[PDB]
Amino acid sequence: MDRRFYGKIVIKGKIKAVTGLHIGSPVIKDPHTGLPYIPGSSLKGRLRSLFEILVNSRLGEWREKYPSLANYSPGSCRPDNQENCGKFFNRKINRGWIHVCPDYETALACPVCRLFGASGKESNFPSRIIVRDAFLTKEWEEKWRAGEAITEAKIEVGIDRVTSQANPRTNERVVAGAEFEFEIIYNVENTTHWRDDIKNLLTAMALLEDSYLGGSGSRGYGKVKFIFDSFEFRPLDYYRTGKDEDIVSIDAREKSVSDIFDSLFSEVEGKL
Protein backbone atom coordinates (compact mmCIF):
# COMPACT_ATOMS: atom_id res chain seq x y z
CA MET A 1 0.00 0.00 0.00
CA ASP A 2 1.31 3.39 -1.25
CA ARG A 3 5.06 3.70 -1.86
CA ARG A 4 5.89 7.28 -2.81
CA PHE A 5 9.13 9.10 -3.59
CA TYR A 6 10.13 12.69 -2.91
CA GLY A 7 13.90 12.54 -3.10
CA LYS A 8 17.03 11.01 -1.65
CA ILE A 9 19.16 12.46 1.16
CA VAL A 10 22.78 11.51 0.44
CA ILE A 11 25.38 11.36 3.22
CA LYS A 12 29.01 11.43 2.15
CA GLY A 13 32.23 11.57 4.08
CA LYS A 14 35.07 9.48 5.44
CA ILE A 15 35.49 6.65 7.92
CA LYS A 16 38.63 7.05 10.00
CA ALA A 17 40.12 3.87 11.39
CA VAL A 18 41.25 5.54 14.60
CA THR A 19 42.57 2.22 15.80
CA GLY A 20 43.17 -0.86 13.67
CA LEU A 21 40.24 -2.30 11.82
CA HIS A 22 39.57 -5.99 11.39
CA ILE A 23 36.85 -7.33 9.11
CA GLY A 24 37.74 -10.93 8.44
CA SER A 25 37.57 -12.99 5.29
CA PRO A 26 42.97 -11.86 6.71
CA VAL A 27 41.08 -8.59 6.18
CA ILE A 28 38.77 -8.54 3.16
CA LYS A 29 40.19 -7.01 0.00
CA ASP A 30 38.44 -6.39 -3.28
CA PRO A 31 39.84 -8.66 -5.99
CA HIS A 32 40.69 -5.95 -8.51
CA THR A 33 42.50 -3.08 -6.80
CA GLY A 34 43.74 -5.34 -4.01
CA LEU A 35 43.27 -2.74 -1.28
CA PRO A 36 41.09 -3.52 1.76
CA TYR A 37 37.61 -2.10 2.11
CA ILE A 38 34.55 -1.92 4.33
CA PRO A 39 31.40 -3.52 2.95
CA GLY A 40 28.00 -2.04 3.35
CA SER A 41 26.76 -5.27 4.78
CA SER A 42 29.25 -5.02 7.62
CA LEU A 43 28.17 -1.44 8.31
CA LYS A 44 24.38 -1.63 7.91
CA GLY A 45 24.38 -4.72 10.06
CA ARG A 46 26.21 -2.81 12.80
CA LEU A 47 24.17 0.36 12.71
CA ARG A 48 21.15 -1.95 12.88
CA SER A 49 22.42 -4.24 15.66
CA LEU A 50 22.94 -1.17 17.87
CA PHE A 51 19.68 0.57 17.15
CA GLU A 52 17.98 -2.79 17.87
CA ILE A 53 19.18 -2.81 21.46
CA LEU A 54 18.49 0.92 21.72
CA VAL A 55 14.85 0.19 20.86
CA ASN A 56 14.74 -2.94 23.05
CA SER A 57 15.66 -0.85 26.07
CA ARG A 58 13.07 1.86 25.32
CA LEU A 59 10.49 -0.64 24.07
CA GLY A 60 7.67 0.54 26.29
CA GLU A 61 8.44 4.23 26.26
CA TRP A 62 7.78 4.78 22.56
CA ARG A 63 4.61 2.84 21.69
CA GLU A 64 2.52 6.02 21.43
CA LYS A 65 5.05 7.50 18.96
CA TYR A 66 5.93 4.24 17.19
CA PRO A 67 2.96 1.85 17.21
CA SER A 68 3.58 -1.88 16.75
CA LEU A 69 6.12 -1.62 19.54
CA ALA A 70 3.17 -2.38 21.79
CA ASN A 71 3.15 -5.90 20.37
CA TYR A 72 6.58 -6.74 21.82
CA SER A 73 8.02 -7.17 25.29
CA PRO A 74 11.78 -7.25 25.81
CA GLY A 75 14.07 -10.20 25.31
CA SER A 76 14.80 -13.01 22.88
CA CYS A 77 12.67 -15.86 21.59
CA ARG A 78 15.33 -18.40 22.50
CA PRO A 79 13.83 -19.55 25.88
CA ASP A 80 10.63 -20.46 23.97
CA ASN A 81 11.50 -21.44 20.40
CA GLN A 82 8.67 -19.79 18.51
CA GLU A 83 8.80 -17.30 15.68
CA ASN A 84 6.38 -14.50 16.50
CA CYS A 85 5.36 -14.20 20.15
CA GLY A 86 5.57 -11.42 22.70
CA LYS A 87 9.36 -11.15 22.51
CA PHE A 88 11.18 -8.52 20.48
CA PHE A 89 13.91 -10.63 18.89
CA ASN A 90 11.54 -12.66 16.77
CA ARG A 91 13.39 -14.21 13.80
CA LYS A 92 15.59 -17.24 13.73
CA ILE A 93 18.28 -16.90 11.09
CA ASN A 94 20.16 -20.18 11.38
CA ARG A 95 20.30 -20.71 15.15
CA GLY A 96 20.28 -17.08 16.30
CA TRP A 97 17.71 -14.43 17.05
CA ILE A 98 17.15 -11.06 15.35
CA HIS A 99 14.28 -8.56 15.30
CA VAL A 100 12.54 -8.38 11.93
CA CYS A 101 8.86 -7.48 11.85
CA PRO A 102 6.77 -10.05 9.88
CA ASP A 103 4.49 -7.82 7.82
CA TYR A 104 4.20 -4.57 5.88
CA GLU A 105 1.74 -2.74 8.08
CA THR A 106 3.44 -3.88 11.26
CA ALA A 107 6.91 -2.84 10.06
CA LEU A 108 5.75 0.49 8.66
CA ALA A 109 5.41 1.62 12.28
CA CYS A 110 8.46 -0.11 13.68
CA PRO A 111 11.28 2.42 14.06
CA VAL A 112 13.93 -0.15 13.24
CA CYS A 113 12.12 -1.63 10.28
CA ARG A 114 10.94 1.50 8.53
CA LEU A 115 14.64 2.45 8.20
CA PHE A 116 16.53 -0.84 7.83
CA GLY A 117 13.71 -2.77 6.20
CA ALA A 118 12.21 -6.13 6.87
CA SER A 119 11.04 -9.33 5.27
CA GLY A 120 8.43 -11.93 5.95
CA LYS A 121 5.74 -14.37 4.78
CA GLU A 122 2.82 -12.89 2.66
CA SER A 123 4.07 -9.27 3.23
CA ASN A 124 7.46 -7.53 2.88
CA PHE A 125 8.88 -4.12 3.79
CA PRO A 126 12.02 -3.04 1.86
CA SER A 127 14.61 -0.67 3.24
CA ARG A 128 14.95 3.06 3.00
CA ILE A 129 18.72 3.34 3.38
CA ILE A 130 21.36 2.15 0.95
CA VAL A 131 24.73 1.61 2.55
CA ARG A 132 27.39 1.37 -0.13
CA ASP A 133 30.80 -0.24 0.13
CA ALA A 134 33.57 1.98 1.43
CA PHE A 135 36.83 1.87 -0.51
CA LEU A 136 40.04 3.70 0.37
CA THR A 137 40.18 7.42 -0.32
CA LYS A 138 42.14 9.24 -3.01
CA GLU A 139 45.00 9.92 -0.58
CA TRP A 140 45.40 6.30 0.42
CA GLU A 141 45.31 4.84 -3.08
CA GLU A 142 48.50 6.85 -3.53
CA LYS A 143 49.94 6.14 -0.08
CA TRP A 144 49.61 2.56 -1.28
CA ARG A 145 51.21 3.63 -4.58
CA ALA A 146 54.08 5.33 -2.76
CA GLY A 147 55.02 2.06 -1.05
CA GLU A 148 53.54 2.27 2.45
CA ALA A 149 52.04 -0.61 4.38
CA ILE A 150 48.26 -0.52 4.26
CA THR A 151 47.79 -3.51 6.59
CA GLU A 152 49.79 -5.05 9.43
CA ALA A 153 50.26 -8.48 10.94
CA LYS A 154 49.78 -8.25 14.69
CA ILE A 155 50.90 -11.11 16.91
CA GLU A 156 48.97 -11.93 20.08
CA VAL A 157 49.33 -14.71 22.62
CA GLY A 158 47.35 -16.64 25.22
CA ILE A 159 48.84 -17.18 28.67
CA ASP A 160 48.05 -20.12 30.94
CA ARG A 161 46.92 -18.80 34.30
CA VAL A 162 48.97 -21.23 36.40
CA THR A 163 52.31 -21.87 34.68
CA SER A 164 52.45 -18.83 32.31
CA GLN A 165 52.51 -21.06 29.25
CA ALA A 166 51.83 -18.79 26.30
CA ASN A 167 50.21 -19.63 22.96
CA PRO A 168 50.62 -17.19 20.06
CA ARG A 169 48.52 -16.41 17.02
CA THR A 170 48.60 -13.85 14.23
CA ASN A 171 45.86 -11.42 13.26
CA GLU A 172 46.02 -9.30 10.15
CA ARG A 173 44.46 -5.85 10.45
CA VAL A 174 44.23 -2.53 8.63
CA VAL A 175 46.75 -0.03 9.95
CA ALA A 176 45.52 2.78 12.19
CA GLY A 177 44.61 6.09 10.64
CA ALA A 178 43.49 4.47 7.37
CA GLU A 179 40.58 6.27 5.87
CA PHE A 180 37.75 4.82 3.78
CA GLU A 181 35.16 6.74 1.77
CA PHE A 182 31.52 5.87 2.40
CA GLU A 183 28.04 6.88 1.27
CA ILE A 184 24.59 6.41 2.84
CA ILE A 185 21.37 7.10 0.94
CA TYR A 186 18.09 7.66 2.73
CA ASN A 187 15.20 7.38 0.29
CA VAL A 188 12.49 9.82 1.28
CA GLU A 189 9.38 7.71 0.86
CA ASN A 190 7.26 9.88 3.15
CA THR A 191 7.49 13.55 4.07
CA THR A 192 5.87 12.99 7.44
CA HIS A 193 8.69 10.91 8.91
CA TRP A 194 12.07 11.68 7.44
CA ARG A 195 13.27 13.66 10.45
CA ASP A 196 12.75 10.64 12.66
CA ASP A 197 14.59 8.35 10.27
CA ILE A 198 17.54 10.68 9.77
CA LYS A 199 17.66 11.15 13.55
CA ASN A 200 17.56 7.42 14.22
CA LEU A 201 20.29 6.89 11.67
CA LEU A 202 22.34 9.47 13.52
CA THR A 203 21.63 7.67 16.81
CA ALA A 204 22.99 4.49 15.23
CA MET A 205 26.03 6.40 13.93
CA ALA A 206 26.74 7.80 17.40
CA LEU A 207 26.43 4.40 19.07
CA LEU A 208 28.79 2.98 16.44
CA GLU A 209 31.19 5.83 17.09
CA ASP A 210 31.42 4.81 20.76
CA SER A 211 31.56 1.07 19.99
CA TYR A 212 33.77 -0.77 17.49
CA LEU A 213 33.30 -2.03 13.92
CA GLY A 214 34.13 -5.63 13.13
CA GLY A 215 36.96 -7.70 14.51
CA SER A 216 37.77 -8.25 18.17
CA GLY A 217 36.77 -4.79 19.27
CA SER A 218 36.73 -5.52 22.97
CA ARG A 219 40.51 -5.79 22.55
CA GLY A 220 40.89 -2.54 20.57
CA TYR A 221 40.30 -3.53 16.93
CA GLY A 222 37.58 -1.05 16.11
CA LYS A 223 37.11 2.63 16.80
CA VAL A 224 35.71 4.16 13.69
CA LYS A 225 35.22 7.93 13.41
CA PHE A 226 32.85 9.64 10.95
CA ILE A 227 34.33 12.67 9.20
CA PHE A 228 31.42 14.31 7.43
CA ASP A 229 31.57 15.95 4.03
CA SER A 230 28.08 16.62 2.64
CA PHE A 231 24.45 16.08 3.36
CA GLU A 232 22.65 16.62 0.09
CA PHE A 233 19.02 16.42 -0.80
CA ARG A 234 18.58 15.65 -4.58
CA PRO A 235 14.84 16.30 -4.86
CA LEU A 236 12.30 14.83 -7.27
CA ASP A 237 13.09 17.49 -9.88
CA TYR A 238 16.87 17.06 -9.79
CA TYR A 239 16.42 13.79 -11.61
CA ARG A 240 14.27 15.17 -14.42
CA THR A 241 15.95 18.44 -15.29
CA GLY A 242 19.46 17.40 -14.34
CA LYS A 243 20.33 20.91 -13.15
CA ASP A 244 22.03 21.46 -9.81
CA GLU A 245 18.84 22.01 -7.82
CA ASP A 246 19.92 20.03 -4.78
CA ILE A 247 20.13 21.47 -1.27
CA VAL A 248 23.41 20.93 0.58
CA SER A 249 23.92 21.13 4.35
CA ILE A 250 27.23 22.79 5.27
CA ASP A 251 28.87 20.42 7.74
CA ALA A 252 32.40 19.79 6.51
CA ARG A 253 33.90 20.10 10.01
CA GLU A 254 31.27 18.67 12.37
CA LYS A 255 30.65 15.64 14.56
CA SER A 256 27.99 12.95 14.25
CA VAL A 257 26.61 14.24 17.57
CA SER A 258 26.80 17.83 16.34
CA ASP A 259 24.34 17.21 13.52
CA ILE A 260 21.89 16.05 16.13
CA PHE A 261 19.51 19.63 13.78
CA ASP A 262 16.84 22.18 13.02
CA SER A 263 19.40 24.74 11.89
CA LEU A 264 21.02 22.44 9.35
CA PHE A 265 18.00 20.97 7.60
CA SER A 266 15.86 24.09 7.23
CA GLU A 267 15.91 24.28 3.42
CA VAL A 268 15.08 20.57 3.22
CA GLU A 269 12.09 21.37 5.46
CA GLY A 270 11.00 24.24 3.23
CA LYS A 271 11.43 22.14 0.11
CA LEU A 272 9.15 19.52 1.79
Binding site: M1, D2, R3, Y104, S123, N124, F125, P126
Partner: protein, 279 residues
Protein backbone atom coordinates in the same frame (compact mmCIF):
# COMPACT_ATOMS: atom_id res chain seq x y z
CA UNK B 1 20.78 -24.22 -57.26
CA UNK B 2 22.60 -21.01 -56.51
CA UNK B 3 20.92 -19.39 -53.54
CA UNK B 4 21.50 -16.16 -51.69
CA UNK B 5 22.33 -16.91 -48.06
CA UNK B 6 21.25 -14.42 -45.41
CA UNK B 7 23.27 -14.78 -42.20
CA UNK B 8 21.87 -13.47 -38.94
CA UNK B 9 24.85 -12.84 -36.68
CA UNK B 10 23.13 -12.79 -33.30
CA UNK B 11 23.40 -9.98 -30.80
CA UNK B 12 21.58 -11.91 -28.11
CA UNK B 13 19.52 -15.01 -27.59
CA UNK B 14 16.70 -15.93 -29.89
CA UNK B 15 13.36 -17.23 -28.69
CA UNK B 16 13.38 -20.03 -31.25
CA UNK B 17 15.14 -20.90 -34.49
CA UNK B 18 12.69 -19.06 -36.77
CA UNK B 19 10.37 -21.01 -39.04
CA UNK B 20 9.68 -19.79 -42.55
CA UNK B 21 6.24 -18.75 -41.33
CA UNK B 22 7.75 -16.32 -38.86
CA UNK B 23 10.42 -15.15 -41.25
CA UNK B 24 7.82 -14.12 -43.81
CA UNK B 25 5.65 -12.47 -41.17
CA UNK B 26 8.61 -10.46 -39.96
CA UNK B 27 9.45 -9.41 -43.52
CA UNK B 28 5.85 -8.33 -44.14
CA UNK B 29 5.79 -6.27 -40.95
CA UNK B 30 9.08 -4.67 -41.95
CA UNK B 31 7.83 -3.79 -45.44
CA UNK B 32 4.61 -2.33 -44.09
CA UNK B 33 6.64 0.02 -41.87
CA UNK B 34 9.36 1.18 -44.26
CA UNK B 35 7.29 1.19 -47.46
CA UNK B 36 3.53 1.08 -46.87
CA UNK B 37 0.46 -1.08 -47.27
CA UNK B 38 0.60 -1.30 -51.07
CA UNK B 39 4.15 -2.69 -51.07
CA UNK B 40 3.36 -5.71 -48.92
CA UNK B 41 0.94 -6.89 -51.57
CA UNK B 42 3.68 -6.63 -54.19
CA UNK B 43 5.90 -8.70 -51.86
CA UNK B 44 3.16 -11.33 -51.64
CA UNK B 45 2.77 -11.30 -55.42
CA UNK B 46 6.52 -11.76 -55.87
CA UNK B 47 6.39 -14.81 -53.60
CA UNK B 48 3.31 -16.18 -55.37
CA UNK B 49 4.81 -15.83 -58.82
CA UNK B 50 8.49 -16.24 -58.10
CA UNK B 51 10.69 -16.29 -55.08
CA UNK B 52 10.84 -18.56 -52.04
CA UNK B 53 12.72 -18.41 -48.74
CA UNK B 54 13.62 -21.24 -46.42
CA UNK B 55 13.62 -21.79 -42.72
CA UNK B 56 16.48 -20.73 -40.52
CA UNK B 57 19.13 -23.32 -39.76
CA UNK B 58 22.11 -23.03 -37.45
CA UNK B 59 25.59 -22.20 -38.60
CA UNK B 60 28.81 -22.44 -36.61
CA UNK B 61 31.86 -20.70 -38.04
CA UNK B 62 31.67 -21.18 -41.84
CA UNK B 63 30.00 -24.60 -41.57
CA UNK B 64 26.37 -24.41 -42.59
CA UNK B 65 23.84 -26.98 -41.48
CA UNK B 66 20.76 -28.09 -43.41
CA UNK B 67 17.96 -30.33 -42.14
CA UNK B 68 18.17 -34.00 -42.70
CA UNK B 69 15.96 -35.38 -45.49
CA UNK B 70 13.44 -37.94 -44.40
CA UNK B 71 14.45 -39.93 -47.48
CA UNK B 72 17.19 -41.70 -45.51
CA UNK B 73 15.01 -43.27 -42.78
CA UNK B 74 13.21 -46.03 -44.77
CA UNK B 75 16.41 -47.34 -46.37
CA UNK B 76 19.07 -46.57 -43.83
CA UNK B 77 19.91 -50.29 -43.81
CA UNK B 78 20.68 -50.40 -47.54
CA UNK B 79 23.15 -47.56 -46.96
CA UNK B 80 24.96 -49.84 -44.53
CA UNK B 81 26.61 -50.10 -36.60
CA UNK B 82 23.28 -50.50 -34.83
CA UNK B 83 24.51 -47.71 -32.59
CA UNK B 84 25.52 -45.84 -35.75
CA UNK B 85 22.18 -46.64 -37.41
CA UNK B 86 20.33 -45.31 -34.39
CA UNK B 87 22.37 -42.13 -33.98
CA UNK B 88 22.11 -41.64 -37.76
CA UNK B 89 18.30 -41.64 -37.48
CA UNK B 90 17.96 -39.53 -34.35
CA UNK B 91 19.99 -36.61 -35.73
CA UNK B 92 18.28 -33.50 -37.05
CA UNK B 93 20.75 -31.28 -38.92
CA UNK B 94 23.33 -32.56 -41.37
CA UNK B 95 26.41 -30.59 -42.45
CA UNK B 96 26.30 -29.06 -45.98
CA UNK B 97 28.89 -31.60 -47.30
CA UNK B 98 27.04 -34.58 -45.68
CA UNK B 99 23.63 -33.25 -46.78
CA UNK B 100 24.76 -33.29 -50.39
CA UNK B 101 25.93 -36.85 -49.75
CA UNK B 102 22.59 -37.97 -48.32
CA UNK B 103 20.61 -36.42 -51.16
CA UNK B 104 22.16 -39.14 -53.34
CA UNK B 105 21.66 -41.93 -50.73
CA UNK B 106 25.31 -42.24 -49.75
CA UNK B 107 26.85 -42.92 -46.33
CA UNK B 108 27.08 -39.72 -44.32
CA UNK B 109 28.17 -38.45 -40.92
CA UNK B 110 26.20 -36.47 -38.36
CA UNK B 111 27.77 -33.47 -36.61
CA UNK B 112 29.01 -34.17 -33.11
CA UNK B 113 27.95 -30.76 -31.76
CA UNK B 114 24.79 -28.65 -31.79
CA UNK B 115 25.46 -24.91 -32.31
CA UNK B 116 23.13 -23.65 -29.54
CA UNK B 117 21.50 -24.48 -26.22
CA UNK B 118 17.88 -24.37 -25.06
CA UNK B 119 18.31 -22.82 -21.65
CA UNK B 120 15.53 -21.63 -19.37
CA UNK B 121 16.37 -18.58 -17.28
CA UNK B 122 14.35 -17.85 -14.14
CA UNK B 123 12.80 -14.42 -14.09
CA UNK B 124 10.88 -12.66 -11.38
CA UNK B 125 8.11 -10.09 -11.05
CA UNK B 126 8.38 -7.65 -8.18
CA UNK B 127 5.59 -5.41 -6.97
CA UNK B 128 6.58 -1.85 -6.51
CA UNK B 129 5.54 -1.43 -2.90
CA UNK B 130 6.69 -4.59 -1.17
CA UNK B 131 9.30 -6.04 -3.61
CA UNK B 132 7.46 -9.34 -3.29
CA UNK B 133 8.46 -11.72 -6.02
CA UNK B 134 6.97 -14.32 -8.35
CA UNK B 135 9.01 -16.58 -10.55
CA UNK B 136 8.31 -17.89 -13.98
CA UNK B 137 10.81 -19.54 -16.26
CA UNK B 138 11.63 -18.49 -19.79
CA UNK B 139 13.17 -20.68 -22.48
CA UNK B 140 15.55 -19.27 -25.07
CA UNK B 141 18.10 -20.33 -27.68
CA UNK B 142 21.54 -19.25 -26.52
CA UNK B 143 24.23 -19.42 -29.21
CA UNK B 144 27.96 -19.96 -29.11
CA UNK B 145 30.64 -17.46 -30.10
CA UNK B 146 30.86 -17.88 -33.88
CA UNK B 147 27.52 -19.62 -34.26
CA UNK B 148 24.23 -18.20 -35.40
CA UNK B 149 21.40 -18.82 -37.82
CA UNK B 150 20.80 -18.36 -41.52
CA UNK B 151 18.31 -18.84 -44.31
CA UNK B 152 18.31 -19.16 -48.07
CA UNK B 153 16.64 -17.17 -50.83
CA UNK B 154 15.85 -18.08 -54.43
CA UNK B 155 14.12 -15.98 -57.06
CA UNK B 156 15.12 -12.78 -58.84
CA UNK B 157 17.33 -9.99 -57.57
CA UNK B 158 15.13 -6.90 -57.75
CA UNK B 159 12.82 -8.53 -55.20
CA UNK B 160 15.78 -9.23 -52.94
CA UNK B 161 17.16 -5.78 -53.50
CA UNK B 162 13.95 -3.83 -53.01
CA UNK B 163 12.21 -5.93 -50.37
CA UNK B 164 14.23 -8.54 -48.47
CA UNK B 165 17.46 -6.59 -48.07
CA UNK B 166 15.69 -3.54 -46.57
CA UNK B 167 13.58 -5.86 -44.44
CA UNK B 168 16.68 -7.43 -42.97
CA UNK B 169 18.17 -4.05 -42.07
CA UNK B 170 14.92 -3.11 -40.39
CA UNK B 171 14.60 -6.35 -38.44
CA UNK B 172 18.14 -6.16 -37.14
CA UNK B 173 16.94 -3.48 -34.75
CA UNK B 174 13.60 -5.13 -33.95
CA UNK B 175 14.01 -8.81 -33.63
CA UNK B 176 12.57 -12.03 -35.05
CA UNK B 177 10.00 -13.11 -32.50
CA UNK B 178 10.17 -13.45 -28.77
CA UNK B 179 10.74 -10.94 -26.05
CA UNK B 180 12.40 -8.55 -28.40
CA UNK B 181 12.25 -5.74 -25.86
CA UNK B 182 14.76 -7.72 -23.80
CA UNK B 183 17.08 -7.58 -26.78
CA UNK B 184 16.34 -11.11 -27.86
CA UNK B 185 15.67 -11.45 -31.54
CA UNK B 186 18.29 -8.93 -32.68
CA UNK B 187 21.11 -9.51 -35.14
CA UNK B 188 23.51 -8.14 -37.72
CA UNK B 189 22.73 -9.19 -41.25
CA UNK B 190 25.21 -10.15 -43.93
CA UNK B 191 24.62 -11.79 -47.28
CA UNK B 192 26.62 -14.41 -49.15
CA UNK B 193 26.00 -16.92 -51.89
CA UNK B 194 25.60 -20.64 -51.27
CA UNK B 195 25.74 -23.27 -53.99
CA UNK B 196 24.07 -26.65 -53.41
CA UNK B 197 24.91 -29.71 -55.50
CA UNK B 198 21.60 -31.48 -55.98
CA UNK B 199 20.43 -34.41 -58.10
CA UNK B 200 17.79 -33.62 -60.66
CA UNK B 201 14.94 -35.96 -59.86
CA UNK B 202 11.17 -35.93 -59.52
CA UNK B 203 11.23 -35.68 -55.73
CA UNK B 204 12.16 -32.66 -53.67
CA UNK B 205 12.90 -32.10 -50.03
CA UNK B 206 11.43 -28.87 -48.74
CA UNK B 207 13.70 -26.61 -46.76
CA UNK B 208 10.75 -24.53 -45.56
CA UNK B 209 7.48 -25.38 -43.87
CA UNK B 210 5.39 -26.80 -46.58
CA UNK B 211 1.59 -26.57 -46.00
CA UNK B 212 0.99 -28.75 -49.05
CA UNK B 213 -1.70 -28.84 -51.70
CA UNK B 214 -1.52 -32.63 -52.00
CA UNK B 215 -0.20 -35.53 -49.96
CA UNK B 216 3.58 -35.84 -49.93
CA UNK B 217 5.72 -38.96 -49.90
CA UNK B 218 7.38 -38.95 -46.48
CA UNK B 219 6.63 -36.23 -44.02
CA UNK B 220 6.98 -35.03 -40.46
CA UNK B 221 3.93 -33.18 -39.29
CA UNK B 222 4.03 -29.86 -37.47
CA UNK B 223 1.10 -27.97 -35.98
CA UNK B 224 1.71 -24.35 -35.26
CA UNK B 225 -0.16 -21.12 -34.92
CA UNK B 226 0.90 -17.54 -34.59
CA UNK B 227 -0.17 -14.13 -33.38
CA UNK B 228 -0.95 -11.37 -35.83
CA UNK B 229 -1.34 -7.90 -34.26
CA UNK B 230 -2.68 -9.43 -31.08
CA UNK B 231 -5.09 -11.83 -32.78
CA UNK B 232 -4.55 -15.54 -32.36
CA UNK B 233 -3.98 -17.46 -35.56
CA UNK B 234 -5.63 -20.88 -35.79
CA UNK B 235 -3.34 -23.90 -35.66
CA UNK B 236 -2.25 -25.11 -39.06
CA UNK B 237 -0.66 -28.40 -40.13
CA UNK B 238 2.59 -27.48 -41.77
CA UNK B 239 4.96 -30.10 -42.86
CA UNK B 240 8.26 -29.72 -41.07
CA UNK B 241 11.42 -29.26 -43.13
CA UNK B 242 13.38 -32.06 -44.69
CA UNK B 243 10.24 -33.67 -46.09
CA UNK B 244 9.70 -35.16 -49.51
CA UNK B 245 7.10 -33.84 -51.90
CA UNK B 246 6.88 -34.33 -55.64
CA UNK B 247 6.05 -31.32 -57.82
CA UNK B 248 4.05 -29.73 -54.99
CA UNK B 249 4.36 -25.93 -55.04
CA UNK B 250 2.82 -25.38 -51.61
CA UNK B 251 0.49 -22.51 -51.02
CA UNK B 252 0.04 -19.42 -48.89
CA UNK B 253 -3.28 -18.94 -47.16
CA UNK B 254 -5.04 -15.69 -46.39
CA UNK B 255 -6.70 -15.45 -42.99
CA UNK B 256 -9.50 -13.26 -41.71
CA UNK B 257 -8.65 -12.36 -38.07
CA UNK B 258 -10.73 -9.15 -37.95
CA UNK B 259 -8.06 -6.63 -39.00
CA UNK B 260 -7.73 -3.74 -41.42
CA UNK B 261 -5.82 -6.04 -43.77
CA UNK B 262 -5.69 -9.67 -44.77
CA UNK B 263 -3.03 -11.81 -43.10
CA UNK B 264 -1.11 -14.24 -45.25
CA UNK B 265 0.46 -17.38 -43.85
CA UNK B 266 3.51 -18.44 -45.85
CA UNK B 267 2.88 -22.00 -46.90
CA UNK B 268 5.18 -22.32 -49.88
CA UNK B 269 7.69 -25.05 -50.53
CA UNK B 270 11.46 -24.72 -51.08
CA UNK B 271 12.40 -27.59 -53.38
CA UNK B 272 15.76 -29.31 -53.56
CA UNK B 273 16.11 -32.45 -55.62
CA UNK B 274 16.43 -35.74 -53.78
CA UNK B 275 16.97 -39.40 -54.68
CA UNK B 276 14.48 -41.80 -53.17
CA UNK B 277 14.52 -45.48 -52.44
CA UNK B 278 11.68 -47.69 -53.69
CA UNK B 279 9.05 -46.13 -51.42
Amino acid sequence: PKFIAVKLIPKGPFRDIPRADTLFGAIGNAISAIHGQSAVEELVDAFVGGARISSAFPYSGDTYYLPKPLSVEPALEGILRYTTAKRLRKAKYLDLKNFELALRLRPFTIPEEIPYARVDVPRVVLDRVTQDSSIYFWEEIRFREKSGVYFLYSGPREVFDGYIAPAMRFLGDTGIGGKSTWGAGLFEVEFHEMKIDAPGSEYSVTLSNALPTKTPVLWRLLRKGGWSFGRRKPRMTFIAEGSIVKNDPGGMERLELGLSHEVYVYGLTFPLGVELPEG
